[PDB]
Structure formats: C-alpha cells, structure tokens
From a paper:
The maintenance of lipid asymmetry (MLA) protein complex is one of the core machineries that transport lipids from/to the outer membrane in gram-negative bacteria. Here, we report the cryo-EM maps of the core MLA complex, [name], from the pathogen [name], in the apo-, ATP- and ADP-bound states, revealing multiple lipid binding sites in the cytosolic and periplasmic side of the complex. The complex has a global C2 symmetry, with six copies of [name] that span the inner membrane from the periplasmic space to the cytosol, two copies of [name] embedded in the membrane (yellow/gold), two copies of the ATPase [name] in the cytosol (green), each bound to a copy of [name] (blue/cyan).
In order to improve the resolution of this structure, we collected a dataset of the same complex, in the presence of the non-hydrolizable ATP analogue App-NHp, using a state-of-the-art Titan Krios instrument. Using this better and larger dataset, we were able to refine the structure to ~3.9 Å resolution. The transmembrane multiprotein complex features a 6-fold symmetric assembly of [name], with the C-terminal helix forming a basket in the periplasmic space, and the N-terminal helix spanning the inner membrane. Intriguingly, while [name] was predicted to have 6 TM helices, we observe that TM1 does not traverse the membrane, but is monotropically embedded in the inner leaflet, a feature similar to the G5G8 human sterol exporter, suggesting similar mechanisms between these complexes, and further supporting the MLA system as a lipid exporter. [name] is bound to [name] away from the nucleotide binding site, similar to the recently reported E. coli MlaBF structure, with the C-termini of [name] binding the opposing [name] subunit by a handshake mode. In the cryo-EM-derived map of MlaBDEFab, we observed well-defined density in the pocket formed between the [name] TM1 and two [name] helices, within the inner leaflet of the lipid bilayer, which could not be interpreted by protein atoms. We also observed that this pocket is coated by cationic residues, mainly Arg14, Arg47 and Arg234 of [name], forming a charged pocket that might attract a lipid head group. As the sample was solubilized in DDM, this density is most likely occupied by the maltoside ring, with the flexible hydrophobic chains extending up into an apolar region of [name]. Accordingly, we observed clear density of the nucleotide and magnesium, within the [name] binding pocket. The resolution was sufficient to map the phosphate binding regions like Walker-A motif around Lys55 of [name], as well as binding of the γ-phosphate by Ser51 and His211 (H-loop).
Author numbering:
A (entry chain C): 8 to 94
B (entry chain L), C (entry chain K): 11 to 263
D (entry chain A), E (entry chain B): 3 to 256
Write the structure that this text describes.
Amino acid sequence: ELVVSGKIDFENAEQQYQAGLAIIKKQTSFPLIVDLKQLEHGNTLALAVLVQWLRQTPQKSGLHFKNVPEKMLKIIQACHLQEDLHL
Amino acid sequence: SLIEVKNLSFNRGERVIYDNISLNIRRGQITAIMGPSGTGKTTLLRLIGGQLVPDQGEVLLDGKDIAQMSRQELFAARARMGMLFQSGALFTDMSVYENVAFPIRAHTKLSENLIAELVALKLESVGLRGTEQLMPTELSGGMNRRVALARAIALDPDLIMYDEPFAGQDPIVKGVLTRLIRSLREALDLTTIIVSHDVPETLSIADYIYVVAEGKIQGEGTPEELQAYASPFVKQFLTGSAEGPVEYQFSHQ
Amino acid sequence: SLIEVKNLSFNRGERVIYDNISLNIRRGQITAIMGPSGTGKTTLLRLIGGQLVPDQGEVLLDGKDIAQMSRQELFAARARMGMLFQSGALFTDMSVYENVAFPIRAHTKLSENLIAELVALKLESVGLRGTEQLMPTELSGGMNRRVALARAIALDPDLIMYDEPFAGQDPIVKGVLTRLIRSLREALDLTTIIVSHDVPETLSIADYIYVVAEGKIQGEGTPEELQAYASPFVKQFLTGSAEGPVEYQFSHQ
Amino acid sequence: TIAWLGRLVIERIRGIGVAALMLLQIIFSLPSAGGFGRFVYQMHRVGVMSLLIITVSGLFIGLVLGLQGYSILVNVGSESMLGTMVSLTLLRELAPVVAALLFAGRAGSALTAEIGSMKQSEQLASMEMIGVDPLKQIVSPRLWAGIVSLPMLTVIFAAIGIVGGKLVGVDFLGVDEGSFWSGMQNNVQFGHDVVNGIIKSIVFALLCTWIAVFQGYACDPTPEGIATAMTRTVVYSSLCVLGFDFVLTAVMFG
Amino acid sequence: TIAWLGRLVIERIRGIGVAALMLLQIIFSLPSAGGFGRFVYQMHRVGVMSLLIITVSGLFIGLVLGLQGYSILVNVGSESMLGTMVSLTLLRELAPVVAALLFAGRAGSALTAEIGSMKQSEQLASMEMIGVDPLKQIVSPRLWAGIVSLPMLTVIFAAIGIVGGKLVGVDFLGVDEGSFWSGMQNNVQFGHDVVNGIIKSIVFALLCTWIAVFQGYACDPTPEGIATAMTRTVVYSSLCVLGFDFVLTAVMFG
Ligand SMILES: Nc1ncnc2c1ncn2[C@@H]1O[C@H](COP(=O)(O)OP(=O)(O)NP(=O)(O)O)[C@@H](O)[C@H]1O
Ligand SMILES: Nc1ncnc2c1ncn2[C@@H]1O[C@H](COP(=O)(O)OP(=O)(O)NP(=O)(O)O)[C@@H](O)[C@H]1O
C-alpha cells in the first residue's frame, strides 16, 4: 500500500530509510505489502534498507516475494538469502 | 563500462615494462591476461588507471581521459573499482567487520544501522556470515581471500580485478574461487579482469584473452582463436611444452 | 632403496600432524603425495628423511632401523639421498660452483681438479654449463631452481625428494621440470618422491599415489585406482570439485 | 671499482631529499579531517609499551652515577657534589641521549618494521585504490605519537635516574641528605637546565621518528628490504642524535 | 585475562634455558679447526664494517665531554680536571657502554637478521642432510667474530674520545697541554682503569653476541618473526649491558 518508491542511492539512504520506518510505525498485521518494482535497480543498499525495515517487526511475516524486481531476486538467490517469501 | 588503454608505454627502474600496449576491455565480459611471470602483470593492472603514471599513452573510462579531468569526478569514479592485490590484503588492525566496512566510509555518510547491514549482506554473498567479530589474522587462507573479496564488492563497483587469484593454492579453493567468479559476474552485472599464470583455468573462464610478454601483446583472441595462431611464443606458452623460444646455457668443449 | 614408514605419529607441540601413517616407498618407482594445503606434507618428508624425531614410529632404510644406527652408519647414509626444498635453498654467500660442489666435501677427500670436473658435469646435465662462477642471486627464476636441483643430484644419491616442484607458476618451467624429472629418473636409476599441489601435474608423473589429509591416509592407488576407489573426500579432492566435505560458517535469523 | 662508492653516496643523498619532501607533505596539520581516536591508540605502541624499558634503564644509570661519583668525591672530601652532579649529568646529557637511543632504539625499529610491512603486504596500495590517502591514516598518527612520547619518556628517565642516584649516594654510602637537596638547588634550575633538557628531546624526537617513518615507507618492495631497513633506522637515528646533541649542547651551555 | 601474563613470562623464561643450552654446545665443542680459517672473513661484517659508526660517535662524545666538563670545571680546576675527567670517563663508563650499545644496534640487528633468514629460507636446514652441523659451520665463526670485534672497537672509541676531549678542552678553550697529559698519567692507572674497561668490554661482547645469535635462530618459521627478532635483540642486549655494567663497575671501583 505505502511504497517507498524511486532510487535508493547511498546519498539519500538515510531519508528513504526513515520514510519506511514511519510507514512501519503505522503498523498493520499482515504488514503492508510494498511494490519494490517501483524502485530503481542496481542498488544493493536498497536491500540493506528493506531488510532493516522488515527486522523492525521480526515477529511478523511481512513477505512480498512477488513484488521483488528480477535483479533484486537474482542477488538474493546468488547470495543464499533465499527464503520462502512466496505469497 | 568499457575501458580503453592505448599506446601505453611505461619505464620503471630504467627498463621498459610496457611498449605500446593496446587493450579493449569489453563490457560485461571476462577479460583475461596471461604471460610469463615477472613481466609486468601486476604493473599493467595498476596502469589501468590506478596509482601509476604512464610515460606515453592514454587511459579512457567511458571514453574520457582520466588524466587531469577532474578531481571531484575522479574521486567519485574510484568508487566503481574493487581489487584483490596478490596474496590479498586485509588490515591486521581491524576486525573482519571493519575490513569489509572500510571503503564505505570513503564515499558515504551513513547511519551505523545501515553500514552494519551492508556488511552483513556482503559477507553472506561469499559465505562468510557470522565471522564479523573475529580478527582476520585468525582466519584460514581460504577465508582470507573471501574476506578481501567481500571488501572489493562492498560498494557495488562495476569493475573487479583479480590479481593472480589462481597462482598458488589448494584444488578445493580453486573450485570455490571459480564458482564465486561465475556467481558474481552475473549477480552484479560485472566486468572482470583475471590475470593469471595458471593457463588451464584461465582458458575456461575468460571470454577473451590477451597474451602479453616482453612488453608487447604477442597474440589475442577468444581461447579458441588463440589456439589457431601458433606463433612459437604463444604456442609454447599456452601448452606448457618445454620446446619453443626459451633458453638453456650450454656449449660443449 | 625401499623405505618403510610404519605407524608414524608426530606432533608439533601439542598438535597432531600425523596419526599412524603407513607408507611403502617402492624401489625404482615414482611415488607421490597429494593433499590439502597445510596438512604436513613437508613434515612427512622431513620425518622420512630422519631429520625429526617420530613419536613411536618406525622408519627403515633397506630394512634397517634408523633409530639404531651408529654415527658412522648415519653419516654414510646421508650420501644416499638429496632433496630440493620449496624455496630452492641456495647459499647466497657462495657462487654456483660451491653450491653444487658443497656436499662433496661432506663425504669425500678429493683433489680440487676432480671436484671441478664433477661440478661441470652436473651442471651440464641440467643445462647450467654456462653459469659457472656467477653468484646465485643473479640468476633468473628458472635458473635459480635448476641450480638447487643440481646440488641434490651431486652425489649420485639413490633417492631424490622434490618438495612442491609443481608449485612453480610459469608454464615454461612446469615443462622443463617435468622433463628433468623424467630424464634424470632414467639416467640415474632414481627412486623419487614428488610432493605437490595442482593435480593436472602429479597424476601424469607418479607411478603410485597416496592421498593424505588430517593425519590419515584417505586412499591409495595408481592414478586409475584412485579414481576407481575415490572415496568422496578423494573424489572431490582430485577433481577440484565444489560441494565436497568443505564447510563455512552458516546460520540465519 | 671506485665508482661503486660514488654511486652509493649519490643515491643516499638523493634519498635524503625525498625524505625531506615527505616530511613537508605530512607535517601540514591536515589529519583533523578524521578522528584522533587513532592517535590515542597509536600512542599505546610507541609510548606506553616502552615504559618498562626506559624505567629499568633509568634506575641502573642512576645507581651507576651514584657509585662513580662517590668514588671520585671521596678523594675531594666534598660529598655535596652528589646532588649537584647527579642532577646536572642527568638533566643535561644523559636523559636526552640515553632515552633517545633506547627509544629509537626499540620504538624506532618497531615502527620502521610496521610501516614497511604495510608497504610490502600491499595494504597501502589498496588504500590508495579505495581513495583514502595513506598519509592521513597510517603515517600521521605515527609521526605525532612519536613526538609526544619521547620527550615525556625523557623526563621519566631523568626522574628515575635522580632517585636511583640518591638511593645509593646518600642512603647506602653515608652522605648527609641535606647537602644533596641543597646541592641540586645550588645551582641547577628548573627554569633553565630542565628546559634545555626538554628542548633537546623535542629535536631528537623529530629526528628519530621522522627517520623511522621514512625508512619503512619509502622503499620499492624488495623482500630483503625489511630487515635491511630496520638496521638502517637504528644506525641513522643514532648518529643523528649524537651529531645534533653536540651542536645543541655547544650553544645551550656555551 | 590475567593468566595471559602468566603464560608470557613462563615461556620467555623457558627460552632463556634454551639459550643457555645452545651456548654450551657452541662453545664446548669445536674440533673442526680446518673450517675456522674462515672466521677472518666473517669478521668483515662485524668488525670492519662497524668502524665508521664507532669512530664518529667516539668523536662526538669526546667533544661533548670536553664542553660540559669545561663549563663546570672552570669553577673548580680545568687545568687539572679536563685531563682527569675526560680520560676516566671514557675508560671507565663510556667506551664500554656507548660502544657496546652502538654495536648491539649495528652489528646485533644485522647479525640476528642474517641468522633469521638462514633459518626462514630453509637454507640452513638443508645442511643437516648433508652431514654438516650448522653450528660448527654457520654459528661458530659469527659468535667468535663478535667476541674479538667489540673489544677492539671499545679501545678505538676511547682513543677517539681522547682526541675529541683534547681538541676542544685544550686547543680551543685555553688549557695547558702539560697538565692535561700529566694529570691523566697521575690519575689513570693501567692497573686498573684501562684494564677494567677491557674486562667489561669482554663481558658485554659475549653477552650481547650470544643473544643476537640465539634470537636469530628462532623456533617459529613465520616472516613476521624476523622483524620481531630484530627488535628483541636490540632490547634485550641493551638492558643486559646496563644491568651487568652496574654490577661490574660497583665491584671494580668500590
Ligand atoms: N615501485 C617499484 N619501483 C621500482 N621497482 C619495482 C617496484 N615494484 C616492484 N619492482 C619491480 O617492477 C616489477 C613489479 O611488477 P610485476 O612485474 O607486474 O610483478 P608480477 O609480474 O605480478 N610479479 P609476479 O607475480 O611474481 O609474476 C618487477 O619487475 C619488480 O622487479
Ligand atoms: N619448532 C617448531 N615449532 C612450531 N612450528 C613449527 C616448528 N617447526 C616447523 N613448524 C611447523 O612446520 C609445519 C610444516 O608443514 P605445513 O604447514 O603443512 O607446510 P607445507 O607442507 O609446506 N604446506 P604445503 O606447501 O601446503 O604442503 C607448519 O605447520 C609449522 O607449524
């Protein structure tokens, strides 16, 4: 529903990070699904941001594998970060 | 991006190491360099646009001459490279966590939370998750190389250089390094350079190979093509035959 | 010479390197030892050579227990073997003449004129006739190593040991050393031991191979038999395959 | 034949010019760009770790001066001189020299080896490839930690030496204590002689550390180079200290 | 945590036991006289190559003693005292210590580095299989060159120091040659002001070289260890010289 869209670069990582945290503060269960295909590709730190966001509510299975960009899922699989995140 | 080096000439210690080298590093491809030891392999990589200054010729990144053009761009441009130098360097005074984290601080200004997460992701990409608090000096040799590589790919660089990664090792490790290269060239859309003496491994990895000796390129091609052009030097070099343009010192009397 | 090694055990300080190794070094044959890096390959040669004290082990030279030999028997026995060490072990303070000549003075009392002729013959047999009177420090890599070998064969020993001869990186050198081993093996009726790394080069030379890891023999056989009975450790080891009994740290939350 | 020496002299002097250039590049107070936590840490290796050696040396020197002074003074019959001479000897000539030589010396050698190792290992090359100028990370805090540490150690050395001097000169050998302390005041002063001892140690600290950094860092990567550099630092550090000690003492007390 | 120190101390002391055993074997049995004809070569790198440093330092020390002696002695008896103090100081305390430490530096680290490499390269080890005992072939002539060389250097250091003292004390600063020379003869006895300088020199020569050989011939074949060995030979022989100097001078002139 609430999607932190656009390019996550190193330079603005801090603000994109806080925007997501604000979305989390307004927490739902099931956690809101984020379309990550609205993000610009080629940024591993985008994942670092996404991982930290999910980990703010680690007890919640807020997984949206369908909305993961192909480049993002390829780095996840290559790096053994693959988990059953299907929905 | 594409990297071009043209008419390179370099003299160190009053000797010429390189004489009019002309290279085309193809984007997204694996480019490899082979040759006799002690002939400039590390030097040539350093002259790609590192810290060495050529006497003649040009270095082009994206077609632009890196010499002079400009300070700020070059500082930022440097964030696009990662390397393993010879045995591979780790800083002894830093934990593994810090060795991987280190280059991040050269170009970014991040919260402790995000720098920590990037280190965790990069260590898992090479099978090192969970070794963050150990000092690097306590690692086995197979792990020292993997830690250094995690540093090299820490900034999402476009070019990874492996300086003689296959030179001397354990067959198990050779299997692992080969796999990491295959995994990463795809996962990160990388352009890579492998410079190595161990011809049998290079021949099955690279898309394109240059054979360099005595300061000159002595033949180029895909591995299939190099085998087709048996200049005595290249042919002996790529086969291991003891016969060819090599010397022994004798004369009977 | 047949060398028996039985129930070998050896610790370096508190660490066990070997645990009941049983070897048969076959007369007139080339035997070889392969295994993972750092598992004591050199330690084993040093024990075979009698330079280390085995812990309750038995070592027999032509059936004779080395532990029971008198000073004269031991001294004379030294003239039965020569070894080429991993670094080449040349003496920097002496010219090539003395480096090859040197061991002759440990066992003989010869006129300077005959000493000089033996040096000339031994250097010729390895292509070093023209290096006479040069200091060894001025030699190129391949030449440097050949001199060291010339010393090892200076006394016409029965047994030659080569410690990591195929770890050289230069394909040209690999060509030459392979030929010298075969050439000398035949010319002098030698029994030899090759202890190395990079499998594409010991599997085509040895007549018989032991695979050693973690203080144990992991299998033995001719190159063909090792593949036939390649217990998974051996199989992946000789193949250089990934997914063998190789671990890395891993857990996630 | 002869030209061999000539080539050696020419290359060593060229090297000095390089060292001078390096000192100029490092000395500008640029390191403020990063944190100084690194400095505090570095001081651990150049200063704190060497206190044991300098302390033991100071005690033996003090006791030796005590016994030699005494066996001469008993032929003058004037024992008040133990105070005056133990103090002047240590403050003017020995603390600034013994401390400088034991310091570099040990710290000198170890520092040379450590920087040189970082060159040989390719660690420094990597830093430039990353983009962090090594002079601001590896060299800077090492040069300054050496500057602060030696002068401070010089003071401790003298302090131990004076105490060691009294311990034998007055307490075992029967000298009336009041003349010892009076002899020190008569006529060596805190505002003059102590000050000159410190000035000489600032000069020595710079010569010793500057050389140690240079010898480690500025060298093409020859494998035998580290051991040679370590020996060379000890020799040059030592002659520079003695050559300068002469010209400075010749002015301060001339 | 704490037991760490415990283990460090225990092992370092075990090592001294080993050193004692090594010394016994090298000195105790040396029958191979035919090969000892080469120690004269070995001496080249201990004695011949070290005169430049000992000579230059001897001159600076002599000149410094001259200037400091003079500025104190103008209030007590320079006409008689420059002679007596310059010669007793150099014969009793400084030639045996300054030369001993400069030597420990220049010859000591170089020698330990050399044995170290002989071991690290495995070159030394290859001799065992040739039947040539490395202690009789490699170590013997090095230890002996050290014993002879330091004492001869010690004398030269003092000889230069006398030239230095006179050069400033008598020739630039206005003192009589007559009383300088006679004063020295009146107070310096061969027995035992010259002789004790030599005795202390022999003790230091043996102790200092013994350590350099021992540490170079290290147990652990790791490259990091060469630099460590070099630093340690300087530190240990340095403290040992000062410790033994104290006891010997205490006896000789007490
Ligand atoms: N900075 C330097 N200045 C002067 N000489 C150097 C320097 N660095 C190394 N040497 C020499 O310059 C060359 C260093 O690079 P290089 O030839 O590329 O090594 P390499 O081929 O990778 N060595 P190797 O891995 O053993 O085959 C060699 O010829 C060295 O003898
Ligand atoms: N006295 C000693 N004390 C402690 N370690 C020692 C000593 N002497 C030698 N070393 C040991 O010597 C061993 C030699 O065997 P190893 O480590 O397997 O090297 P290697 O055989 O050349 N390795 P590789 O080339 O892969 O076959 C090392 O593990 C060192 O610890």
